[PDB]
Amino acid sequence: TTTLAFRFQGGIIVAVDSRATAGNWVASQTVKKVIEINPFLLGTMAGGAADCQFWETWLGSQCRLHELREKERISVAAASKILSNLVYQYKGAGLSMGTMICGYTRKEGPTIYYVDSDGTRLKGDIFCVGSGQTFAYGVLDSNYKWDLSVEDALYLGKRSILAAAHRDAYSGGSVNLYHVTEDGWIYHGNHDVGELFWKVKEEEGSFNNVIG
Amino acid sequence: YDLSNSVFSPDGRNFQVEYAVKAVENGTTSIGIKCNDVVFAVEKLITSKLLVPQKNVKIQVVDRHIGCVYSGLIPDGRHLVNRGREEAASFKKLYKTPIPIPAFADRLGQYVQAHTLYNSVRPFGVSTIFGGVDKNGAHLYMLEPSGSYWGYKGAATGKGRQSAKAELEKLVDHHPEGLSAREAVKQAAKIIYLAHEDNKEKDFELEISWCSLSETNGLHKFVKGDLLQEAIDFAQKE
Amino acid sequence: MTDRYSFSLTTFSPSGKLGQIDYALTAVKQGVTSLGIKATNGVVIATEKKSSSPLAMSETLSKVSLLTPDIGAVYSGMGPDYRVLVDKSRKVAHTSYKRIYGEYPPTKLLVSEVAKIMQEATQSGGVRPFGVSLLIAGHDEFNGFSLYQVDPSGSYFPWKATAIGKGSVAAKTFLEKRWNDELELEDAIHIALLTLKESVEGEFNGDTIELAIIGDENPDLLGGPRFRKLTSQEINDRLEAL
Amino acid sequence: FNPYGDNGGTILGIAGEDFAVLAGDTRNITDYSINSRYEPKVFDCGDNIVMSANGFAADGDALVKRFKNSVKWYHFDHNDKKLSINSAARNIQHLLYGKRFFPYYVHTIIAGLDEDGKGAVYSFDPVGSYEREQCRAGGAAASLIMPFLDNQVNFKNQYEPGTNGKVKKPLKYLSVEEVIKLVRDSFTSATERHIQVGDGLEILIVTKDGVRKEFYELKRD
Amino acid sequence: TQQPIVTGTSVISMKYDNGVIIAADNLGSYGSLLRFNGVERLIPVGDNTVVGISGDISDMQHIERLLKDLVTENAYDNPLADAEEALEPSYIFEYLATVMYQRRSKMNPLWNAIIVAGVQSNGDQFLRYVNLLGVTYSSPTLATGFGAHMANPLLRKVVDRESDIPKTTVQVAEEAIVNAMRVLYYRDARSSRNFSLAIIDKNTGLTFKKNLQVENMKWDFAKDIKGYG
Amino acid sequence: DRGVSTFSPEGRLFQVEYSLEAIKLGSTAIGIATKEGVVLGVEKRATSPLLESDSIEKIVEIDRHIGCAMSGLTADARSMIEHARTAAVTHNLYYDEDINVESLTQSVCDLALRFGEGASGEERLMSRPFGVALLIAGHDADDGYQLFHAEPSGTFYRYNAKAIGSGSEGAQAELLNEWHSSLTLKEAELLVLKILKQVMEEKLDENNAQLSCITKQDGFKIYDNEKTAELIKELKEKEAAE
Amino acid sequence: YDRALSIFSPDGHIFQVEYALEAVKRGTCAVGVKGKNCVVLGCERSKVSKIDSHVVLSFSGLNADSRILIEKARVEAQSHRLTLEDPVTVEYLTRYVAGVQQRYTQSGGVRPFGVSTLIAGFDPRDDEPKLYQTEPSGIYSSWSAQTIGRNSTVREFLEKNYDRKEPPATVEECVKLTVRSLLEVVQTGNIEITVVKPDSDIVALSSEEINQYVTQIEQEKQEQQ
Amino acid sequence: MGSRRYDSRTTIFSPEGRLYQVEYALESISHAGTALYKLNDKIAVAVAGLTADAEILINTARIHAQNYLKTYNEDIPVEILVRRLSDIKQGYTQHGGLRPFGVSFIYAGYDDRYGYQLYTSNPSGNYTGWKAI
Amino acid sequence: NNYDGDTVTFSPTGRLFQVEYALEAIKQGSVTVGLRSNTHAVLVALKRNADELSSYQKKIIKCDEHMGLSLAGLAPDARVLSNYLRQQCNYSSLVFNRKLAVERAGHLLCDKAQKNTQSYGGRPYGVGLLIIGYDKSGAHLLEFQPSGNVTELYGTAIGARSQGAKTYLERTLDTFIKIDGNPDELIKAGVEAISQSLRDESLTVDNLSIAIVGKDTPFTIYDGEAVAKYI
C-alpha cells in the first residue's frame, strides 16, 4: 500500500498498488484501492478497506444529494469536511482510515485533502500514505515541479509506485493510475509491477544491483 | 351526559355502559350450566349456506382449564380472551400453578372496570360466561360490560336470555342435588334449542364444550362426535 | 386511557378575569372563619371546628398542622385539598431546603414554595386550582415572627392580623378595631377567643375550636419546637377566665 | 464467555466466461472432533445467485437467512424485479457493515451471472468490504489452493518453450469441465494436507439455464 | 449465564430405519460432588418430540418451561392442534435455535447443548443439534459433551452414513445405545449408573423407559492388578 | 367533522376531500408521455409584474432520470421532494442502481398517506394531509417512460397524458381528444404549449409558462427561455398556417 | 399538546394561515428596492437585523416571532459556515426560513408565524444583488420591490416608478426612490433606511441624512409642480 | 371524545389576526395597579398583575443572569436578560396549549455598554426601551 | 348525530356509526368475488380507471407464496393490512419454519381491526378483504370486514352490486366445491359468478384480474393478456 497523489499544471495524478496481505500471506493482488466517489471525485483506500469503501460511498451519496438540492457541484473542501465530521463521531470506536480526496473544481482548481480516522483534515500538494510511503514520497520530492506534462506526471507516479513496491514487501501487485481534470477522472489502465520493473530497468539504467 | 365514557349522570348512572349493554342484547344466545363435576353452549347464526360448517368456533380456551363464551361484539370478546390469556400466562409464570377461577374472574373484572374510567376508550360490548375446574372444584362466572361479575349456578345472555334463564331456574329447582356432566350437556342443548325461538326464521348451529373432573381429567374439551349428536337429538325431541 | 389533557383549564375572560380562580375563591368564602394574630412574642392561629356527624370523633381530624417545628398552617375551604397541600409542603420543606443547607427553611421561603405549588395548579394542563386559602404562622431567627396568607391564585400577602371565611369581614373589622403595638401571646389568644366567640353562632367550648401558637421555646417537647397546639382542657380553662 | 467459534470449512468460487462455480467441503468440526460429515455450506438464494459463508457456522446461517429475506422483500417491494449480482453484493456489504462492531466471523463468496451474461464472483471480508474477482478461495485451506489456481488458471510463471522466457503463455478459454477438474484436484490436495479439510465436495454451477448441483466423495468417509 | 453451577452430562442419540433413539443419565453434579440424583433430562414435547439437554440444569428448567408454554400456545384457537396443526420437531428446533442465537448475541447465553429428536408428520426422522453460540448441525448419530468423544465412535460403527440408516433395526440401535451408556459410565467421572431412554417410532410412537441401570459391567480383572511397577 | 381522521356518512374523509378542493385551485400543470420522452409543462402566475419569473420553480428534479411537477400548495411539496430525493439516493446507495419510477411514486404516496396512520407500523409527524398534487415523470429499463399522478389520498395512477390544476377539466378533455400512442417529442411539446395557452387567461409567453423533458439519453432537463420562445414561435406559425 | 390547529376548510382553505396573513397586514410597512448595485431596505415606525455579514432581514407582523426566526436564521448561517467553510447564500437562507415557516403550518399544537420576511444581500464572490420575500404560508420568491407591509398603494407606486429596462444604477437614486415610496404613505418624518453593498458593506443611514432626503423630496415636489 | 374541553384553543389567531388570550391578559393587567425585585446587583424589575407568575419569571431571570455570570465572568447586559424573558413569555403565546402569563414587567438596569437603561415587556413577548415612563 | 364524532361513542341503541361509515365506504368499491374447492382457491376482481387515459388500479395483493388477498374500498388500508400479513407470514416462516395458516392470519387481522375501533385518536379501516390460501388443512377462503369480523365461506363477494355474484354462488354451491381436477374450470365458475354483478359492462383484458392458489400451485396472478382465454 502506497497510494500516492499529487497536483500539477494538468490537474491531479493518483497512483495506487493492488496488494492485500493477511498474516504475511498475500490474500489478493487485484485489489482496487481507488474509490470513485462520483464522476468528479476520487478517494484512496488505506487502513480498513471496509470503512473506506462504505464511508466513501456514503460521501458520494451525500454529494449527490447536495448537488440535487443546490443545483451546483460540491467543492472538494466541503466533501472532505463532511467526511471528516462523519469520521470524528466514531473516534475511539476502532475505525481505521486514511484517504486522499482529490478533485478539480472551477472555483478552487485542483485540490487534494488528506483525512485520517483520527479527525485530521489538511489540504496539500503531494501525499503518500501507506507502508511504503517513504520511498514514493522521496521519489516524488526528488522529481517534482509545477511544470510537468501529463505523460511525465503519469510516468512519475508509476516510477514512485514501482520504487515503493520494490522496497516494501507489503506493496505491489499492479499499478493503477488516474488523471483528474476539471471534467472528471480518466483511467490509465492497470500495469503489472513485475513487467514494469524490467521495463524501467531496461529503459533507465536504474536497479543495477538487481541481476537481470 | 351520554357523550363521554367517564361522566356521571345527575342520578349517578353511566349511559355509555348502558349502551354497551344494549349492544350486548343484540348478540346471540350463550348459556353456561354448572354441575357437581362446567358446560358452555352457544348458538351460531347461519346467515347464509355459504358458511363452512364447524369453522367459526366461538368458545375459547384459556390455559388448559378455562372455557369462555361471550355475547355481543365478537372482536371485543376475542380481545378480552387475549388479555385473559396474557394474565393467566403471567400468573402461571410467577407462581407455577394454574390460575384459580376466582383470580381469573377478578383479573377480567379489573380490566373491564379500568376500561370504564376514562373517556379515551369505550366499554366492552360483550357479556362473558366463563368457567372451569381448579383445586377447589368447579366454578362458573358471568361478567358484564360494567365490570361487575358474579358466580352463578346457571347463566345466560343474548337475545333469548329470558327463556334460557327461566329454563335454568326450573332445572335448578328440579335438581336440588345437582346434575351430572352428560345430563348438563343435554340440558344446555335443550335450553339453546328453546331459546332459539326468538328468531325461528333463521338456521342455527349448536356448539357445546365442557370441563369437569372425570371424562375430561379436569381440562376443557369441546363436545364433538356422538355425544353432540345425542345432545342435539335430545334437544329436538323435547 | 391516555391523559390527553395537556391544555390548561384556566384561561382569561374577555374582561380580564380568570374564571376558575374566582370560582375557587367563591368556594373558599363559604368555609369556616379562621383567624391569625401576630404579636411581639408569638403568633396565634385559631379556627372553628364542625361536626359532620354526632358519632364522629372530632379529634381524629386536625384543622391545624405542623409544617415545620417552627411553622404551622390553617386553612379555609376544601379539607382534602388542604391535607394534600400540607403533605406537599412538608415534603418540600425537606427535599429543597433542609437536605441542602442543614436548617429548616424560613417562613417566607416556605410560603413562597407553597404559593408556587398553588400557582402551578392554575397554569398547567388537566388540573384545577386548589379551593383553599391558607394562613401560615412561623418564626425564624432573622425575620422574627411572621404571618402570611396564600390565596388559590398563588399570591401571598403578609398580615399583622387577618381572618378568612364566612365571617371574614366582621372578624377583620373586630381585629382592626383595636390592634395595639404591645400585643402579647396571651393577649393575642384572648383577642382571638373573643373574636371567634363573636363570630360563632354558639357552642363555643374547647372541643368546637382549634388553636395553635408559635413562640418562645418548648424543650420539654424536644424529647425545642416553637409550635404548640393547645389541648382541649387548656382551652376550656382559658374560656373559664374569658 | 467467548461468543465466537470455528467450524473449519473450505470454499472456492471461480467465474467463467458464461458460467460460475462455487464449491465447498462438507465437514463440520470443532477442536479435533467431527461434528458432521455432511453439513452443506453452499446455498441457492434465488435469482441465479449462489452464496456461501465460511467460518462461524451460526453467523453464516444467520447471514444466509438474512440475505434470503432481503431478496424476498426486494421482490415484494419492486414488482418481482430480478436482483442483479452487483445489487446483491452491495446489499450484502450493507448487511455485513450494519454490525461492524459485533462482526460476523465469516468470509462470504457469492456467484452468479452479470447483466451481460458473464460469470461473476464477489468476495467479502468479515466487516463488509467486497470485490469482484475471477478466482477466490476461502477457509483454512485457501493458502494451499490459490497458488495452484494462479499457476493453472492464469498460467503465471509460465512461458512459451523456445523463447527463453520472452513470451508469456497466452490465456485460453476454459470449459466448465476443466474448472470442475481443477476444483476437484485442489480440494483433493487440501484434504491430503489439511486435517480440517475433506469429507465430501459439493459444487454448484450457475448458468443461464439455472443452478445445478454435483457431489463427490473425499477421504474419511 | 456466565458460568454453569449445576451441570448435566452427555446426551446421546441415533437414527434407525423407523425412528430415533435418545438417551441421557440422571445426574445433577455440582462440580466434583454428585449432589443431585433422579434428574430427568429428556423432555417429551407432544407425542412425537424429545428434547435432550446437557449442561446447566437451571437453564434446562427454563427452556422446558418455554417448551410447555409453546405447547400451550399452539393449542389456542386451533381446532386441529392434535391432528394436523400440531407441533413438529422441526418447528421446535427452529424456535430453540432462534432463542439460543438471540441469547448468544446479547452475551447472555444459555449454557446448554440440546438434541432434538422425533418423527416428522411425513414419516421422516428428525435429529438435530444446537448449543450456545447458536451452532447447529445434523448427523445420523449425535452426542453432546463427553459422549461426543466416546459414544460417537461406537455408534458410527453401526450407522456410518445415510445409507446405513434403513439397514438398522430398533433392537440393534438400542443395544448400541446401552453399550455406549455403559462405556460412558466406565470412563466419565461425572456419569451416573442410572439413565433414561426414549424411542420415537413412526409406527409405534413414543416409548419412554425410565430408571434404567448400567449392568453387565466387568471388574474381575482388577483383582490381578497390584502396585504400579 | 371535528376530527382529522373522521369518516363522513358517505364513507370518505373530510380532510382528504378538502385537500383535493385546495388542489383544484392551483396552477395548471400538464404532462404527456410518449415512446421517446415525457414532457412536463407548468404555468407560472405572478401577482405583480415586479416579480422575477425565473424564481418560480414548479418543475423540480428528483433524480437524473426522474422529474416532478407540482400543483396546489407549493410550500407543502418541499418535504415531499426532499423525501423523494432521499429515497432515490438511498436506493442507489443500497443497491447500486436507479430506483424504479413506480417504486418512487409508491414511496411518495406512502409518505403522503403516512402521518395519519403508519403504513409500516410507524407514528405520525404532520397534522393535516398535503395540499399539493404531483406529476412524476421518469424512465426505467423495466417498463420504459412512465408518468404518474399522485394525490394526497395516498393513491396514484399511471396516465398517458394528465393535466391538473384550475383548468384541469378542459385540458383533460383536450388531452383525451388529442393524445395517441404515436406522438413525438416535438408534437408533445407543441400540444402542451397549445393547451397551456388555451387554459391560461393571459397570453402565452416564455415568462409565464415553463417546459421540461425527461428522456433516456439526456436524462431530465429544463428548457431555457430561448428554447421555449422558439417553440412558441413554431406553434404560432403552425397555427397560422395549418 | 398535539391538536391540529391548522386544518383544511370545506372550501379548500387553511384559516390559520389566512389569519396569520391578516396579522402580517397590520404592522408597519417594509419596503425593499434593488438597483444595479446595492439594496435599500426602508422601515416605518432595530427593524433590520444582520443575520450574517452579507445578508440582512426585515420583517412585517409580530416582533417576537420575527426575533425567533432571526435567531434560527443566524444559527443556520453559523452552522453552514462551520460545516461547508463557505458563507451562506441569500437563496439558501431564504429557503431555510421559508421551510421553517411552512413546517410550523403542518405541526400540531403550534400556530403559524404572523411574520412576512424580506431578505436582502449578495452571494459570496458575487456582485449581483439578491432580494427575496417569504410569506407566513412558507412560500418564498424573488423580487425587486415588494412592500410586504400594509399601510393603507406603495406597490402601485413602485410598479410605476421602476425599471423601464433601466435599474437605478446609482445608490443615491435607489435611496431616493425608497424614501419617496415610504413617504407616499407616511405623513411625518418615522423612516429608516439600510443600504447593502458587496464585500459585506452594510450601512444604516443616519436620521440627519434621511431628513435631508425628505426635505429634498418635498422641495422637488413643490418646485417643478 | 378524548378531551373536547380545549378552552377556545388559546394559541390560535382571530379572524382579524389578533390573539385573544394576549389581549385579555393585557386587559387584566390594565385592571391591576399602577407601577420591587432585584434580579442581580445591577438590574431591578417592577411587576404588574399576577404576582405569582411575576415571582416565577423573576426566579427564572435570576437563574439566567447567574448562569451568564458563571459562563462569561461578567455581569449580563440588560438587553440580553430582557430578551430572554420576553422570549420565555412569547413561547407560551405560540405553543404549549397553556394560558399566557398575565404579568407586565418594567426593567431598570445598568451595563458597561449603554450606561443606564429602561425597558418594558408585556405578555405578547414584545419588549420596548423607554427614555422615561 | 351526536354520537358520530368518534369511534369511542356508543349510540343509544348500541351502534358504532364510524364503523358503519367505514362499512359503507366498501359499498362504493368495485365488486370482487372469491371461491374455493378442495384443492384450489380463486379470486376474480373487476378493476376501475380514473378515465380513458389512466390505467386500472391493482386489486390483488400477494402476501406469501401460499396466501393472497383481494381488496374492496380504500386501497392504502389494504396496503397496510397486506404489509402486516406479509410481516406475520415472514415471522412464522423464520422463527418456526412453518407455513402460516389462513385462520391464524384471520385472527391477527381481526385483532388489529378491533384495536382501531376502541381507542380515541384513531379510525377504523375502510376496506373489505377476500383472503385465499392453502395450508396443511387444505384450501381456505375468508371474508374480512373493518369491524373485525372474519368469516369462512365456500364463496363470497364484496363491493358494489355484489348480490348477484353471491346469489349465483349460493345457487351453484354444490357444483364448484367438487371442481378439483381443473383449476381453469374453477376460474371459469368465478368469472361466470362475477359476470352476474356487471351493470351494462363487458369484461375486458384491461379490467379483469384473476388470482389462484392451490395444492401444487404457488399464489399466481393473471392480468392483461393472461386473462384473454377466461373472457
Side-chain angles (χ1 to χ4, degrees), chain D residues 1-5 56 58-59 102-103 105, chain E residues 101 104-105 107 132-134:
Chain D
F1 171 65
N2 180 25
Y4 291 109
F56 204 4
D59 284 358
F102 195 8
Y105 189 65
Chain E
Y101 186 77
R104 163 228 179 267
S105 299
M107 303 298 296
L132 33 66
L133 311 184

Side-chain angles (χ1 to χ4, degrees), chain G residues 48-63:
Chain G
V48 176
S49 299
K50 295 189 299 298
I51 303 180
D52 204 330
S53 296
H54 60 289
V55 290
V56 291
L57 174 53
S58 181
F59 68 96
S60 298
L62 303 179
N63 304 335

Side-chain angles (χ1 to χ4, degrees), chain B residues 163 167 189-198 235 238:
Chain B
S163 300
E167 293 292 339
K190 185 201 65 178
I191 292 177
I192 285 299
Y193 259 81
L194 290 177
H196 179 61
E197 295 297 330
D198 296 68
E238 304 293 340

Side-chain angles (χ1 to χ4, degrees), chain A residues 31-32 51 55 57 195, chain D residues 90 97 100 131 136 168:
Chain A
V31 178
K32 314 254 74 177
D51 305 331
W55 293 126
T57 312
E195 309 169 359
Chain D
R90 196 173 227 84
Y97 203 86
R100 185 203 172 274
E131 279 189 341
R136 174 57 79 102
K168 293 186 174 183

Side-chain angles (χ1 to χ4, degrees), chain E residues 7-32:
Chain E
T7 64
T9 340
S10 303
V11 184
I12 65 177
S13 59
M14 64 180 301
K15 312 183 194 184
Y16 64 94
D17 58 351
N18 291 326
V20 196
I21 298 182
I22 173 177
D25 74 327
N26 297 120
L27 231 182
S29 300
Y30 186 66
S32 57

Side-chain angles (χ1 to χ4, degrees), chain C residues 1-19:
Chain C
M1 302 180 62
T2 316
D3 198 325
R4 42 84 247 252
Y5 265 86
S6 52
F7 59 89
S8 59
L9 295 176
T10 299
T11 47
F12 291 93
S13 66
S15 65
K17 305 184 185 64
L18 295 168

